[PDB]
Write a protein that binds this ligand. Structure first.
Ligand SMILES: CCCCCCCCCCCCCCCCCC(=O)OC[C@H](COP(=O)([O-])OCC(O)COP(=O)([O-])OC[C@@H](COC(=O)CCCCCCCCCCCCCCCCC)OC(=O)CCCCCCCCCCCCCCCCC)OC(=O)CCCCCCCCCCCCCCCCC
Ligand SMILES: CCCCC/C=C/C/C=C/C/C=C\C/C=C\CCCC(=O)O[C@H](COC(=O)CCCCCCCCCCCCCCCCC)COP(=O)(O)O[C@@H]1[C@H](O)[C@H](O)[C@@H](O)[C@H](O)[C@H]1O
Ligand SMILES: CCCCC/C=C/C/C=C/C/C=C\C/C=C\CCCC(=O)O[C@H](COC(=O)CCCCCCCCCCCCCCCCC)COP(=O)(O)O[C@@H]1[C@H](O)[C@H](O)[C@@H](O)[C@H](O)[C@H]1O
Ligand SMILES: CCCCC/C=C/C/C=C/C/C=C\C/C=C\CCCC(=O)O[C@H](COC(=O)CCCCCCCCCCCCCCCCC)COP(=O)(O)O[C@@H]1[C@H](O)[C@H](O)[C@@H](O)[C@H](O)[C@H]1O
Ligand SMILES: COC1=C(OC)C(=O)C(C/C=C(\C)CC/C=C(\C)CC/C=C(\C)CC/C=C(/C)CC/C=C(\C)CC/C=C(\C)CC/C=C(\C)CC/C=C(/C)CCC=C(C)C)=C(C)C1=O
Ligand SMILES: CCCCC/C=C/C/C=C/CCCCCCCC(=O)O[C@H](COC(=O)CCCCCCCCCCCCCCC)COP(=O)(O)OCC[N+](C)(C)C
Ligand SMILES: CCCCCCCCCCCC(=O)OC[C@H](COP(=O)(O)OCC[N+](C)(C)C)OC(=O)CCCCCCCCCCC
Lengths: 180, 171, 469, 89, 116, 86, 86, 60, 329
């Protein structure tokens, strides 16, 4: 049970390709819900069990529900993935795939050197040593510290965020009412 | 400080202390005896423990190696407290931490055994259980009569010993 | 005190009827005036470039940012006067210049999000404020929803703002992955030498800059500015420009960058020669904004660029504001009103404007020659003080490209003049109803600033010398 | 960093070469935000701090609000045109 | 290897088994008679699920606070008070505007009977 | 009055959940070795449980109380080596 | 801010190197910053472990080519079932 | 809470001695690995002279 | 490994029997409320009738219409079956007796309850008819609208415990239950629980064959007992009846397997008697009341219950503030 992270990486690739090539618009949206589940798997896998259920609650249970709710009672035309339509795209898809992929891998590195910048992204092989220290006396888990720092050090960010939630109330109402 | 996830595998080390540092014998008490005698370890070994953590504060970052000589003495003084409490109060110390291994190691559920243990240790080992930072006009929690938080089931050996200490006049 | 206005306002607007909207805006207009007048004495806090950080190194308040918030309030007073006052009392201008119920809500929320960018110190304050102002521009674009062009423009602006917000988020977390930090106060003159922060900080600046309309990605914004109605587009052209550029000028993370110099050369080129053969007045008017944002991308390369910036900002703001208000006024004299949201489109529709209200053409000529940079007017000293910073700091090819770009851009500025001073067959003699006293006084104030504002240059340089040094 | 980088890149290119409908563009936007989340939360775990977790919990809320705003924007796009084209807006 | 994951994998085994039992067990035998544009909708239908999400995002924003409630005592309390009241003001916007109503288009036609 | 037939399927629901809870409690106590479960475990108490598994010798929560620790206790100490996190 | 706050609310893993670098940067003005280059280096490889990855690759390159391998007090791996077995 | 901080230095001295022993063991181990080949294993990669536990071991 | 799989198939046999007999119980008490007998035709006193119905409906013809996604239409039953059943882990039948003791149990119980909306909405896209869509729209709109106030009541209750562990809440409720101070919240939570299953007090959209029917059927009553379990742990006492320390000091003398057996019997008998009274009240409110228009329902949730809930958000931390009573982790 070593290669779990590699498996989630591969399954996420495959799920995005099934997102962007799908018969029916909501077959594509169910593949997105599956990608959210693969994400939450990776987040529990890395050690963040809190966030995975936050993803399942907020992204799956509200955003995907809103999205499916939109696709139901609105009319959306769709062409399917013809080969006549989209292999005119493929040479720039290949060039931009390799370039954007390498370039996203580039900025984790500090060299003057171009491909020493690149292959330090693959210098991964060393197993981190986890030590126990007995300095912490209480059950401050991660949600507790998020609640301490949203509320003391970044209280202003929480209140500007309240203004953003207010805007998310006012705006959709203001569009779709047709006042008398 | 962070905990291991995503396929940690445990490993241990076939080695020894170097000759530079002397032998120190270890604490062999587990969590219920350690939690039982925590306040008496803290009552006797307060200046030793505080000199050890003051060492760790004073020479920052060196840490481990420059504070070994007092990490020796905190372990030895706690071992002294634990064998002291064994040879005087073995049966009710055992009564206490055998209560404590049920009830999620909650100190809230073992009041009638800890009254017996505090009385023995205070008259024979002459160490008192105190909670600091508690100003007056505030009652300590393990002294109060009819607390709101009672355990599910009181242990049978400790309520029997508590009643027999009532009728002996021990307590 | 914006927060007070929003909190008061949506409470008050939910209970008003739609008959009261215009009067509500008048109330807010006067409110903002007394926030300028009764509360600007806070400039005394910022003596000798004393800088504060507020909310735990979260917001940064210096005198630069104080000037920027004063400028944003002045412009909001002008724009809210344009919504809250009638042009004429016809049954025509009531069906043309009509505010929605929730328009001033979104205005004040956007002014809030625009202030929390310039006043920002950390990256999550920057992010949250960028999305606050971005959602507000989405909804200000989409609020006149009985219009095909504005609906299509709001959808386009949603997707093109979403990409360039995810690029900012990628750059921020990419900066976090190499430095356990959020501040650019972390940088402090030594880290930049021993660390390659070039790709990070330049990708940050680029993701911030493509929302202004810099040159490879300019056409989508020109289409949004042509498709929105004429009152909305004077606000959404100005406010993200001055907020995002006032962030990127205060934070000097692209000093002597080759990419920003490439895109500044390209911006000056494609804005000058892009709007030459164009026949719509908002198109013509938006490529002017493209060039004048290029002149700011120039100052992004600079260290210590706060005079040239702030002068050319209030220059461009007054000139921009006045040239949109003049073509609001020319709608009374055109022979053809289409398109209720956008009643004047083609620039040949103002053709006989010297024979009907010649002093509107005097107004127009003044602000157009200040766009060109003619020395008695205020735009000249803006271009002059930009050149004094470009040449001081070694950008010699950039200087000649600036000069050629201004010469090419003078053609389509003067095309407005060339159309308006011309013969027309049927001229006005006698018109019964009058333009708004309150609202033509604003245009005259904006002209008198442009023409007679060179008087106060030495006063302004001395007050500059004390509060920023 | 690999999973967040590749979901962001593949999500971006699926957004760019979308010619088939409009809601693929919405869901590619949301999966881009997911990939940004993945990269940041990994960095927070590796650096032993909450501040990446702070920016991640804030960008969750901002992604939700942008979905609500933009889908009301699509509904108003649809009000006057009772059809959504396949080629795009 | 806990008793948590046998559940996660075993509930599908339950389902896969039962719909197998029916598909394996019952008659198919269909035919034509057994087998077998777009409508418009009111604004409150789409409105309930669009405005649902900003309240849901607030409810899970309280979730970091109510776990940290002891540590931020007297201070995070007031920050949360201000947060809640800022969102209560947008809610009183929403119910003052009568947004979520679907209201009936035909009245008793109140207008009176006048003559000549 | 009271229909016994109406409340008998409630009686079987009650009996099934009662017998399930009782059988499950005895299964938990048999797993622990005669004591109750720990229903809320800290990071501190997680580290304390692994330390006591190290000290007692093999057994789960045998809970030795000894004066001074054994000989193999100084040598059976564990670090955890976690994989690259790709 | 949340400058040095960890997941448990304590100080993060590289807090002490960062606080040493800030102790450096507090008592220095510019023109004199070239001397606190080592502290910053100590911070950066605290973050990313670049020099330790280089060093461990240099030592693993040598232990791969030995027929002898390891003549040392070795390290044992256990299953999680057997932390304190013997 | 006061019980746990009475217990803290007692276990901290423990894990400190375990850290010192296993780190000096690993140091001597890679010294016994790279005998012959001229290479400094005692040298820290950190520029400060403070002691540090090693990390990032090769998987077994 | 023998231990945990025998434990989990004991838990599965208990809960999947008890969701079957809940059906037999609702028919019988609906009958006696209407002054007639329930079923007595199929068992000795009417029992194993849910078995008779399941035996017959696993013999029933499945019709996949002209209009339909076939795959979507038969795995929407399973995704609603599986997430209506997955939430049965975290409920305790005693202190620490769950199928998985995780310290974030309410976050899990709250995340699984939001996964249950899809098999309504998604299965509207099955058999795409213009009336087969907007009925699912009204269904999912009501569903999300009432899980809002469900989540709200949860977060109000966690203001007293400050822990997302579930048996920690029940051990916290030993001093007093949470219905006794917050009895309006018991009324609000009961009606939100009735709405969240779309019970026929709060039903509008009612007003397949075989496997897609029996999966929806089992998911309905598993949701019944699951939200009843949520009510039982965070609002009533979970497994708590009385002290029972004095009775044990009379009866027993030391810890034996019969004493743990007796204690588990008492704890899960208390939990089951809460749950059984709650399911009786579900059927009892089904018997007595007509149904709702969609507008009465949306007006009810968004205009009546939610402002009152905002008032509760303000009032309860303020009284935890006035007396310096903040709960510690
Ligand atoms: C609940 C109590 C409410 C009953 C009211 C009084 C009884 C009665 O006669 O009612 C009709 C009464 C007149 O009755 P009647 O027909 O003229 O005379 C009937 C005969 O007396 C004949 O009356 P009866 O024999 O039916 O009742 C006698 C009573 C008294 O008899 C005794 O003296 C012995 C008492 C021993 C304890 C009995 C335990 C009963 C447990 C019931 C379970 C809960 C229900 O107790 C019993 O013996 C009833 C036996 C019930 C067996 C049920 C089988 C279920 C087993 C499931 C196994 C579960 C594991 C455990 O009129 C009213 O009470 C009007 C009020 C109606 C509304 C009251 C609602 C209050 C309760 C709400 C409960 C919510 C659930
Ligand atoms: C959208 C949604 C999000 C999508 C994400 C997917 C993609 C992610 C990757 C992210 C990229 C985002 C794109 C960013 C835009 C491009 C950014 C960019 O070119 O800045 C360059 C990169 O400076 C590198 O050091 C040069 C960098 C070289 C990169 C090599 C790439 C190799 C690819 C091989 C195939 C900035 O140099 P710069 O202009 O300051 O120029 C420097 C100058 O070179 C130095 O001599 C001086 O010291 C300095 O003063 C300054 O003058
Ligand atoms: C130092 C920095 C530089 C700042 C430059 C300042 C720019 C704007 C400053 C504005 C301050 C304005 C002072 C002007 C006050 C005097 C003024 O002309 O009255 C207004 C314009 O009133 C604004 O339009 C009021 C505009 C208020 C805008 C305030 C902006 C702050 C023009 O009335 P008016 O006579 O034509 O017309 C009226 C009216 O038409 C008839 O119905 C009545 O019979 C009679 O009342 C008649 O008088
Ligand atoms: C789990 C189990 C616990 C369940 C307990 C409930 C017990 C219920 C009692 C069940 C009794 C079985 C009665 C079931 C019954 O109608 O089958 C008759 C056959 O004629 C028998 O009678 C044949 C009877 C077959 C009886 C079983 C034979 C051994 C098992 C073979 C597998 C059905 O013919 P049929 O051609 O339409 O059936 C087939 C078939 O069901 C489908 O898979 C095909 O797709 C379909 O085309 C169709 O052709
Ligand atoms: C006539 O008015 C009505 C009633 O009478 C009042 C009803 O009861 C009801 C409710 C209807 C019912 C309860 C019939 C239920 C239908 C069934 C097919 C019962 C099926 C039983 C099961 C699926 C139990 C399954 C259990 C297992 C597979 C055990 C697993 C181990 C309705 C809808 C109604 O309209
Ligand atoms: C009761 C008064 C209430 C407050 C009124 C404030 C309104 C804000 C309006 C902004 C747009 C209108 C232009 C006004 C320019 C003001 C110049 C100035 O003074 O800005 C200063 C220099 O600006 C700089 O570097 C560069 C600034 C460049 C200015 C270039 C335009 C020149 C011509 C127009 C300005 C002169 C008009 C004077 C007409 C009598 C920098 O900030 P300060 O802390 O010293 O501000 C103090 C102003 N107080 C005292 C009125 C608050
Ligand atoms: C759990 C406790 C549930 C007890 C259920 C008893 C019902 C019963 O025993 O039903 C007996 C059944 C049905 O008999 P019937 O002829 O249809 O009844 C007619 C009665 N009249 C005359 C009143 C109408 O007979 C059997 O052989 C079924 C044997 C399988 C039993 C499986 C039990 C699973 C549980």
């Amino acid at each position: 049970t070593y290669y779990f992270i590699e498996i989630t990486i591969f399954l996420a690739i495959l799920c995005t390709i099934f997102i962007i090539s799908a018969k029916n618009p909501m077959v594509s949206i169910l593949y997105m819900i599956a990608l959210f589940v693969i994400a939450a798997m990776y987040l529990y896998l890395i050690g963040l069990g809190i966030f995975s259920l936050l993803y399942i609650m907020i992204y799956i249970g509200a955003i995907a529900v809103l999205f499916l709710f939109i696709i139901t009672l609105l009319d959306i035309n769709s062409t399917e993935l013809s080969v006549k339509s989209n292999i005119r795209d493929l040479p720039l898809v290949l060039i931009s795939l390799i370039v954007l992929t390498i370039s996203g891998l580039m900025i984790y590195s500090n060299d003057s050197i171009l491909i020493n910048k690149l292959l330090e992204a693959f210098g991964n092989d060393y197993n981190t040593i986890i030590t126990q220290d007995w300095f912490n006396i209480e059950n401050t888990t991660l949600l507790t510290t998020i609640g301490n720092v949203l509320l003391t050090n970044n209280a202003f960010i929480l209140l500007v965020l309240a203004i953003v939630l207010l805007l998310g109330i006012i705006g959709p109402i203001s569009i779709t009412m047709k006042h008398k | 400080p962070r905990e291991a996830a995503a396929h940690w595998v445990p490993f241990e080390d076939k080695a020894n202390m170097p000759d530079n540092v002397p032998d120190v014998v270890e604490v062999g008490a587990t969590s219920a005896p350690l939690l039982s005698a925590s306040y008496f370890i803290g009552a006797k070994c307060k200046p030793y423990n505080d000199d050890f953590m003051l060492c760790r504060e004073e020479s920052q970052g060196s840490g481990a190696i420059d504070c070994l000589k007092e990490g020796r003495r905190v372990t030895r003084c706690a071992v002294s407290v634990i064998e002291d409490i064994n040879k005087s109060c073995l049966d009710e110390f055992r009564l206490h931490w055998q209560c404590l291994e049920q009830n999620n190691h909650q100190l809230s559920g073992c009041r009638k055994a800890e009254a017996l243990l505090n009385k023995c240790v205070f008259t024979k080992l002459n160490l008192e259980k105190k909670i600091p930072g508690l100003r007056p006009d505030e009652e300590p929690v393990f002294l109060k009569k009819d607390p709101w938080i009672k355990p599910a089931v009181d242990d049978f050996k400790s309520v029997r010993a508590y009643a027999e200490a009532k009728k002996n006049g021990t307590l | 005190m914006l927060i007070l206005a929003i909190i008061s306002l949506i409470t008050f607007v939910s209970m008003s009827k739609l008959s009261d909207n215009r009067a509500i805006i008048r109330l807010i207009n006067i409110y903002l005036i007394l926030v300028l007048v009764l509360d600007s004495f806070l400039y005394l806090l910022f003596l000798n470039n004393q800088t504060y950080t507020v909310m735990g190194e979260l917001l940064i308040f210096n005198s630069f940012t104080f000037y920027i918030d004063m400028l944003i309030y002045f412009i909001m007073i002008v724009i809210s006067s344009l919504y809250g006052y009638n042009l004429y009392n016809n049954n025509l201008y009531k069906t043309l210049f009509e505010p929605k119920k929730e328009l001033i809500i979104l205005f004040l929320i956007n002014i809030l999000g625009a202030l929390l960018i310039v006043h920002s110190n950390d990256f999550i304050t920057l992010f949250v404020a960028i999305e606050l102002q971005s959602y507000s521009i989405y909804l200000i674009t989409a609020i006149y929803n009985s219009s095909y062009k504005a609906s299509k423009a709001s959808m386009l602006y949603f997707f093109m703002g979403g990409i360039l917000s995810i690029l900012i988020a990628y750059s921020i977390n990419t900066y976090y992955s190499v430095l356990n930090s959020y501040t650019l106060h972390s940088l402090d003159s030594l880290i930049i030498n021993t660390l390659d922060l070039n790709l990070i900080l330049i990708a940050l600046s680029l993701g911030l800059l493509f929302k202004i309309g810099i040159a490879p990605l300019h056409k989508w914004l020109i289409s949004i500015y042509e498709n929105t109605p004429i009152l909305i587009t004077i606000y959404i052209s100005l406010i993200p420009k001055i907020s995002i550029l006032s962030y990127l000028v205060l934070s000097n993370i692209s000093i002597n960058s080759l990419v920003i110099s490439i895109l500044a050369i390209l911006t000056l080129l494609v804005g000058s020669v892009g709007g030459l053969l164009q026949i719509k007045i908002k198109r013509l008017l938006a490529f002017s904004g493209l060039t004048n944002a290029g002149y700011m991308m120039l100052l992004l390369l600079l260290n210590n660029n706060e005079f040239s910036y702030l002068y050319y900002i209030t220059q461009y703001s007054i000139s921009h504001l006045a040239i949109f208000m003049i073509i609001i006024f020319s709608i009374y004299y055109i022979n053809y009103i289409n398109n209720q949201y956008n009643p004047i489109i083609y620039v040949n529709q103002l053709k006989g404007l010297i024979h009907d209200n010649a002093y509107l053409v005097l107004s127009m000529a003044i602000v157009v020659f200040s766009f060109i940079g003619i020395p008695p007017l205020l735009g000249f000293f803006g271009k002059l003080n930009i050149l004094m910073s470009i040449l001081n700091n070694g950008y010699y090819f950039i200087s000649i490209v600036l000069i050629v770009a201004s010469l090419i851009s003078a053609l389509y500025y003067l095309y407005l003049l060339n159309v308006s001073i011309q013969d027309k067959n049927n001229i006005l003699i006698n018109s019964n109803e009058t333009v708004s006293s309150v609202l033509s006084y604003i245009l005259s104030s904006l002209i008198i600033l442009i023409t007679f504002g060179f008087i106060y240059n030495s006063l302004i340089i001395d007050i500059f010398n004390v509060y920023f040094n | 960093m690999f999973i967040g980088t590749i979901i962001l890149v593949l999500s971006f290119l699926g957004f760019v070469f979308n010619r088939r409908n409009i809601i693929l563009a919405f869901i590619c936007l949301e999966t881009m935000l997911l990939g940004i989340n993945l990269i940041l939360l990994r960095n927070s775990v590796l650096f032993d701090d909450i501040s990446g977790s702070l920016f991640a919990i804030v960008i969750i809320i901002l992604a939700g609000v942008e979905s609500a705003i933009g889908l009301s924007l699509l509904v108003s796009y649809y009000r006057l045109r009772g059809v959504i084209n396949s080629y795009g807006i | 290897m806990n008793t948590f994951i046998i559940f996660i994998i075993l509930i599908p085994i339950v389902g896969f088994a039962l719909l197998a039992v029916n598909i394996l067990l019952a008659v198919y035998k269909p035919y034509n008679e057994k087998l077998g544009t777009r409508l418009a909708f009111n604004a409150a239908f789409i409105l309930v699920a669009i405005l649902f999400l900003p309240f849901d995002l607030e409810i899970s924003t309280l979730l970091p606070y109510v776990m940290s409630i002891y540590l931020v005592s007297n201070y995070g309390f007031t920050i949360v008070l201000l947060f809640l009241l800022i969102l209560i003001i947008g809610f009183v916007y929403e119910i003052n505007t009568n947004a979520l109503k679907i209201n009936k288009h035909n009245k008793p036609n109140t207008d009176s009977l006048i003559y000549k | 009055a009271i229909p016994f037939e109406a409340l008998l399927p409630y009686g079987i629901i009650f009996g099934l959940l009662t017998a399930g809870g009782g059988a499950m409690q005895v299964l938990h106590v048999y797993r622990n070795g005669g004591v109750r479960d720990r229903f809320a475990i800290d990071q501190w108490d997680s580290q304390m449980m692994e330390r006591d598994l190290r000290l007692n010798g093999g057994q789960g929560r045998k809970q030795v109380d000894q004066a001074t620790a054994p000989e193999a206790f100084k040598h059976n100490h564990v670090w955890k080596s976690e994989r690259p996190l790709i | 801010t949340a400058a040095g706050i960890s997941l448990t609310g304590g100080r993060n893993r590289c807090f002490s190197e960062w606080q040493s670098f800030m102790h450096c940067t507090a008592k220095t003005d510019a023109k004199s910053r070239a001397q606190c280059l080592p502290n910053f280096e100590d911070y950066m490889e605290c973050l990313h472990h670049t020099k330790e990855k280089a060093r461990l690759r240099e030592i693993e390159s040598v232990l791969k080519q030995k027929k002898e391998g390891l003549e040392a007090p070795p390290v044992k791996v256990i299953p999680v079932k057997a932390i304190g077995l013997v | 809470l006061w019980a746990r901080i009475y217990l803290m230095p007692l276990l901290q001295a423990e894990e400190d001695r375990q850290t010192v022993r296993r780190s000096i063991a690993q140091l001597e181990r890679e010294k016994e690995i790279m005998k012959g080949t001229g290479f400094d294993v005692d040298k820290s990669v950190y520029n400060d002279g403070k002691f540090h536990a090693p990390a990032l071991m090769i998987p077994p | 490994m023998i231990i945990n799989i025998v434990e989990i198939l004991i838990f599965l046999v208990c809960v999947l029997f008890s969701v079957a007999y809940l059906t037999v119980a609702e028919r019988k008490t609906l009958a006696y409320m209407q002054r007639r007998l329930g079923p007595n035709f199929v068992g000795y006193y009417g029992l194993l009738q849910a078995f008779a119905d399941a035996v017959k409906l696993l013999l029933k013809e499945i019709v996949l219409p002209k209009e339909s996604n076939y795959i979507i239409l038969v795995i929407s039953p399973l995704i609603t079956l599986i997430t209506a059943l997955i939430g049965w882990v975290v409920i305790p039948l005693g202190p620490g007796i769950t199928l998985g003791e995780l310290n974030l149990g309410i976050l899990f119980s709250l995340a699984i309850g939001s996964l249950g909306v899809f098999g309504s909405l998604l299965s509207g896209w099955s058999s795409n008819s213009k009336y087969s869509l907007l009925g699912s729209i009204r269904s999912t709109a009501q569903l999300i609208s009432y899980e809002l106030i469900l989540t709200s009541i949860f977060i109000i209750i966690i203001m007293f415990v400050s822990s997302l562990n579930i048996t920690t809440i029940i051990e916290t409720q030993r001093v007093v239950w949470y219905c006794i101070p917050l009895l309006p919240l018991l009324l609000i939570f009961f009606i939100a629980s009735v709405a969240e299953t779309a019970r026929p007090p709060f039903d509008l959209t009612e007003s397949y064959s075989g496997s897609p029917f029996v999966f929806f059927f089992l998911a309905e009553y598993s949701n019944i007992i699951l939200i009843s379990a949520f009510n039982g742990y965070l609002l009533l006492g979970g497994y708590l009846s009385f002290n029972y320390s004095y009775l044990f000091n009379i009866l027993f003398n030391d810890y034996s397997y019969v004493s743990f057996l007796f204690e588990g019997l008492i704890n899960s008998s208390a939990y089951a008697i809460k749950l059984v009274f709650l399911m009786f009240s579900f059927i009892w409110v089904r018997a007595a009341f007509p149904r709702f228009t969609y507008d009465n329902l949306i007006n009810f949730c968004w205009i009546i219950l939610l402002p009152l809930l905002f008032g509760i958000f303000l009032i309860i931390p303020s009284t935890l503030y006035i007396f310096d009573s903040f709960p510690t982790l």
